[PDB]
Design an enzyme around this catalytic site. Structure first.
Site, PDB file in Angstrom:
ATOM      1  N   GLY A  28       0.840  -1.181   0.000  1.00 45.79           N
ATOM      2  CA  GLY A  28       0.000   0.000   0.000  1.00 45.79           C
ATOM      3  C   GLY A  28       0.877   1.234   0.000  1.00 45.79           C
ATOM      4  N   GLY A  82       0.926   5.726   0.715  1.00 43.72           N
ATOM      5  CA  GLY A  82       0.375   6.894   1.367  1.00 43.72           C
ATOM      6  C   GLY A  82       1.142   8.149   0.999  1.00 43.72           C
ATOM      7  N   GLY A 131       5.032   7.779   2.260  1.00 44.27           N
ATOM      8  CA  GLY A 131       5.808   6.620   1.866  1.00 44.27           C
ATOM      9  C   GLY A 131       4.975   5.429   1.436  1.00 44.27           C
ATOM     10  N   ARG A 132       5.296   4.254   1.963  1.00 46.23           N
ATOM     11  CA  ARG A 132       4.625   3.035   1.546  1.00 46.23           C
ATOM     12  C   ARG A 132       4.632   2.052   2.709  1.00 46.23           C
ATOM     13  NH1 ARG A 132       6.688   1.286  -3.476  1.00 46.23           N
ATOM     14  NH2 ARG A 132       6.977   3.483  -3.995  1.00 46.23           N
ATOM     15  N   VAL A 133       3.820   1.004   2.582  1.00 50.47           N
ATOM     16  CA  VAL A 133       3.942  -0.193   3.404  1.00 50.47           C
ATOM     17  C   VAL A 133       4.404  -1.322   2.495  1.00 50.47           C
ATOM     18  CG1 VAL A 133       2.787  -1.823   4.878  1.00 50.47           C
ATOM     19  CG2 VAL A 133       2.169   0.567   5.012  1.00 50.47           C
ATOM     20  N   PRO A 179      -2.373 -11.033   6.211  1.00 54.95           N
ATOM     21  CA  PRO A 179      -2.361 -11.389   4.779  1.00 54.95           C
ATOM     22  C   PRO A 179      -3.711 -11.352   4.074  1.00 54.95           C
ATOM     23  CG  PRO A 179      -2.276 -13.349   6.133  1.00 54.95           C
ATOM     24  CD  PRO A 179      -2.187 -12.201   7.087  1.00 54.95           C
ATOM     25  N   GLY A 180      -4.810 -11.144   4.786  1.00 60.82           N
ATOM     26  CA  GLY A 180      -6.114 -11.257   4.172  1.00 60.82           C
ATOM     27  C   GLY A 180      -6.520 -10.067   3.342  1.00 60.82           C
ATOM     28  N   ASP A 205      -8.944   8.009  12.147  1.00 63.46           N
ATOM     29  CA  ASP A 205      -8.867   7.687  10.717  1.00 63.46           C
ATOM     30  C   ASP A 205      -9.580   6.370  10.387  1.00 63.46           C
ATOM     31  OD1 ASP A 205      -8.288   8.261   8.019  1.00 63.46           O
ATOM     32  OD2 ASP A 205      -6.275   7.378   8.182  1.00 63.46           O
ATOM     33  N   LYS A 265     -11.727   3.867   8.480  1.00 61.91           N
ATOM     34  CA  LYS A 265     -12.190   3.685   7.101  1.00 61.91           C
ATOM     35  C   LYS A 265     -11.817   2.271   6.672  1.00 61.91           C
ATOM     36  CE  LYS A 265      -8.023   6.147   5.407  1.00 61.91           C
ATOM     37  NZ  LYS A 265      -7.478   7.263   4.615  1.00 61.91           N
ATOM     38  N   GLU A 322     -10.096   1.177   4.273  1.00 62.69           N
ATOM     39  CA  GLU A 322      -8.697   1.100   3.862  1.00 62.69           C
ATOM     40  C   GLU A 322      -7.780   0.722   5.008  1.00 62.69           C
ATOM     41  OE1 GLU A 322     -11.044   3.343   2.968  1.00 62.69           O
ATOM     42  OE2 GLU A 322     -10.355   4.595   1.282  1.00 62.69           O
ATOM     43  N   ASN A 323      -8.152   1.068   6.234  1.00 58.33           N
ATOM     44  CA  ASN A 323      -7.304   0.889   7.402  1.00 58.33           C
ATOM     45  C   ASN A 323      -7.667  -0.352   8.207  1.00 58.33           C
ATOM     46  OD1 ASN A 323      -5.765   3.094   6.838  1.00 58.33           O
ATOM     47  ND2 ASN A 323      -6.684   4.362   8.419  1.00 58.33           N
ATOM     48  N   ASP A 355      -2.545   1.695  10.786  1.00 57.12           N
ATOM     49  CA  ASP A 355      -2.402   3.097  10.448  1.00 57.12           C
ATOM     50  C   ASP A 355      -2.836   3.963  11.617  1.00 57.12           C
ATOM     51  OD1 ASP A 355      -1.927   5.499   9.507  1.00 57.12           O
ATOM     52  OD2 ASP A 355      -2.798   5.229   7.501  1.00 57.12           O
ATOM     53  N   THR A 381      -9.932  11.704   7.092  1.00 57.92           N
ATOM     54  CA  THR A 381     -10.274  11.455   5.694  1.00 57.92           C
ATOM     55  C   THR A 381     -11.635  12.062   5.392  1.00 57.92           C
ATOM     56  OG1 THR A 381      -8.968   9.417   5.633  1.00 57.92           O
ATOM     57  CG2 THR A 381     -10.625   9.654   3.964  1.00 57.92           C
TER      58      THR A 381
HETATM   59  C1  LIG Z   1       0.119  -4.437   8.989  1.00 54.63           C
HETATM   60  C2  LIG Z   1      -0.197  -3.618   7.777  1.00 54.63           C
HETATM   61  N1  LIG Z   1      -0.353  -2.292   7.844  1.00 54.63           N
HETATM   62  N2  LIG Z   1      -0.761  -1.926   6.576  1.00 54.63           N
HETATM   63  C3  LIG Z   1      -0.825  -2.974   5.745  1.00 54.63           C
HETATM   64  C4  LIG Z   1      -1.200  -2.834   4.303  1.00 54.63           C
HETATM   65  C5  LIG Z   1      -0.482  -4.057   6.488  1.00 54.63           C
HETATM   66 BR1  LIG Z   1      -0.471  -5.842   6.005  1.00 54.63          BR
END
Ligand SMILES: Cc1n[nH]c(C)c1Br
Lengths: 353, 13
Positions: free
Chosen positions: A53, A55, A58-60, A127-128, A169, A171, A173-174, A187, A204
């Site tokens: 993902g 943001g 940065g990123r995850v 992982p889901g 936050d 939503k 997405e989180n 998040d 958001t």
């Molecule tokens: C633990 C985590 N935080 N954000 C994502 C996309 C994960 Br998997």
């Protein structure tokens, strides 16, 4: 009354036991809050696999710890991008809160560290996938399935708010789905310890309470408003204040008007009108009876709160998992190399991280 | 009509 003798006694005892649980959870939180951990790993300890993902900062990434082989989700923040004053404070909030909380529906932080260019937070990999992509794919969830997820959020907010933490936050997405079909909130970038009011304009658009938009000092009741938005979106497939641009979203939120799909039950509509309540003297979660107005609402009558906490309720679905490190439940993102400057950046701004 | 993709948080405004 509504409850007979036995039911009223059982509920009262249950509510007292919640108080006992929260008092102990607060003692455990404060120990960690007053003595945070830091610098528990370094970048070269991990193989970077894939971006899960993105943001603003940065990123995850899915990473694999070299020595143990465990997979983790690593949030990377570019220190320079964390430029605005509230961007910086919020990042310190995020790490300090995540290292101190403990609840079955909150993601677990394993390591944090920083280098010349970036800040890093290494969390358990869930992982889901995001609720967001499951919801967009199916359209909407049934009321029983929305209720299963909503109950987890209610308990999570009851926990966080007892510690004087506002989440800010909520939503889809989180909200990540774990291997048992339960939620993990991720998040914490906007979470904050707040004893009364706070004033930052953040969150958001679709999920903002009216008092945020109106530049009023606000409290934890913004999270209960956001729960109303989430339940509505899960059950409808779209949120209640829906428009192409933020300014139009904000005008709808402030109006004090909500319309419901014809398939929403009357119990659901009643709950939502009480959560999506512009008048703070009337909003559920913000009254004398606190969270109990929500937990005891008719729409939650079938919810066994303890069984949800114990993860003993059958989940609506179990994500397909094809081995450790599988990323099939996540969308693809553009991959960008992680560059570490030879010169330390913004060292003074992030001394405490 | 409204936003169907992932929604970014706002730090101000
Ligand atoms: C633990 C985590 N935080 N954000 C994502 C996309 C994960 Br998997």
């Amino acid at each position: 009354g509504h409850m007979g003798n036995a039911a009223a006694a059982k509920k009262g005892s249950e509510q007292e036991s919640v108080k006992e649980f929260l008092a102990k959870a607060k003692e455990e939180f404060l120990k960690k809050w007053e003595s945070p951990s830091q610098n528990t790993a370094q970048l070269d300890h991990f193989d970077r696999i894939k971006t899960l993902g993105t943001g603003s900062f940065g990123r995850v990434m899915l990473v694999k710890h070299k020595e143990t082989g465990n997979h983790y989700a690593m949030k990377i923040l570019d220190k320079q991008k964390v430029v605005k004053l509230k961007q910086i404070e919020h990042t310190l909030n995020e790490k300090r809160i995540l290292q101190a909380v403990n609840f079955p529906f909150l993601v677990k932080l394993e390591f944090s560290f920083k280098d010349n260019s970036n800040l890093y937070m290494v969390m358990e990999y869930v992982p889901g996938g995001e609720m967001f992509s499951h919801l967009r794919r199916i359209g909407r969830f049934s009321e029983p399935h929305a209720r299963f997820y909503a109950a987890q959020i209610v308990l999570t907010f009851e926990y966080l708010h007892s510690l004087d933490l506002i989440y800010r936050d909520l939503k889809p997405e989180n909200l990540l789905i774990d291997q048992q079909g339960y939620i993990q909130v991720t998040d914490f970038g906007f979470a904050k310890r707040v004893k009364g009011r706070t004033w930052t304009l953040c969150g958001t658009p679709e999920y903002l309470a009216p008092e945020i938009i109106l530049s009023k000092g606000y409290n934890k009741a913004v999270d209960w408003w956001a729960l109303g938005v989430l339940i509505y979106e899960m059950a409808a497939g779209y949120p209640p204040f829906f428009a192409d641009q933020p300014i139009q979203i904000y005008e709808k939120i402030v109006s004090g008007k909500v319309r419901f799909p014809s398939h929403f039950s009357s119990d659901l509509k009643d709950l939502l009108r009480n959560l999506l309540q512009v008048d703070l003297t009337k909003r559920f979660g913000n009254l004398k009876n606190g969270v109990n107005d929500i937990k005891n609402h008719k729409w939650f009558a079938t919810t066994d709160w303890i069984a949800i906490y114990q993860r003993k309720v059958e989940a609506p679905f179990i994500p397909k998992f094809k081995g450790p490190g599988d990323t099939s439940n996540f969308d693809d993102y553009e991959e960008e190399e992680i560059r570490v400057s030879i010169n330390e950046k913004c060292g003074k701004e992030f001394t405490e991280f | 009509a409204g936003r169907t993709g992932r929604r970014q948080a706002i730090h101000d405004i």
